[PDB]
């Protein structure tokens, strides 16, 4: 019997999607500097 | 060598030794996790005759 | 590279990108029914 699930491995998904969400989040904050 | 490198031998050895029985918690999932963790504690590195 | 200014260009021109960008998908959609 497997010790742990092979998917969807929440921890791996949180970091990958958080980093992607962080990258676009940086762009949103980046693009508002010259808007003022 | 085949017996040394086999997963089954490691599992049956760990299940028999006293190093693991005294570390049992009583929860099936925890015991399985501990056994699987201690399986990887034994690593077999095959040798090469070319490099002696 | 003024990415901050660039984001306002597509934000104001979002109608143009959506207007004809989806047209390309519609163009290829009929191509599916035109093929084996």
Curated annotation (Swiss-Prot), chain A:
Disrupted gene: phenotype observed: Null mutation abolishes ECA(CYC) synthesis.
Domain of life according to the entry = Bacteria
- TM spans (from-to): 11-31
Q: Which residues lie on this side of the membrane: Cytoplasmic?
A: 32-36
Please state where this protein is localized. Answer: Cell inner membrane
Physiological role: Modulates the polysaccharide chain length of enterobacterial common antigen (ECA). Required for the assembly of the phosphoglyceride-linked form of ECA (ECA(PG)) and the water-soluble cyclic form of ECA (ECA(CYC)).
Note the subunit structure: Probably part of a complex composed of WzxE, WzyE and WzzE.
Q: Please report which protein family the annotation says this sequence is part of.
A: Belongs to the WzzB/Cld/Rol family.
Q: What is this protein called?
A: ECA polysaccharide chain length modulation protein
From Swiss-Prot, chain C:
Classification of source organism:
Bacteria, Pseudomonadati, Pseudomonadota, Gammaproteobacteria, Enterobacterales
**How would you summarize the oligomeric state and partners of this protein?**
Probably part of a complex composed of WzxE, WzyE and WzzE.
Location of this chain's protein in the cell: Cell inner membrane
- The protein here is known as ECA polysaccharide chain length modulation protein
Source organism of this protein record: Escherichia coli (strain K12)
Q: What happens when the gene is disrupted?
A: Null mutation abolishes ECA(CYC) synthesis.
Gene symbol? wzzE
Q: What is this protein's function per UniProt?
A: Modulates the polysaccharide chain length of enterobacterial common antigen (ECA). Required for the assembly of the phosphoglyceride-linked form of ECA (ECA(PG)) and the water-soluble cyclic form of ECA (ECA(CYC)).
- List residues traversing the bilayer: 15-35
Family assignment?
Answer: Belongs to the WzzB/Cld/Rol family.
């Amino acid at each position: 019997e497997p010790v742990k699930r092979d998917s969807p491995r929440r921890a791996f998904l949180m970091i990958m999607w958080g980093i992607v969400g962080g990258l676009i989040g940086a762009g949103v904050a980046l693009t508002r500097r010259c808007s003022k | 060598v085949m017996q040394l490198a086999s997963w089954d031998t490691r599992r049956e050895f760990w299940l028999q030794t006293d190093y693991y029985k005294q570390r049992m918690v009583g929860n099936s999932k925890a015991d399985a996790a501990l056994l699987d963790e201690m399986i990887n504690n034994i690593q077999f590195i095959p040798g090469d005759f070319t490099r002696a | 590279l003024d990415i901050r200014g660039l984001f306002r260009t597509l934000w104001a021109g979002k109608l143009w990108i959506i207007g004809m960008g989806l047209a390309f998908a519609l163009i290829a959609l009929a191509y599916t029914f035109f093929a084996r």
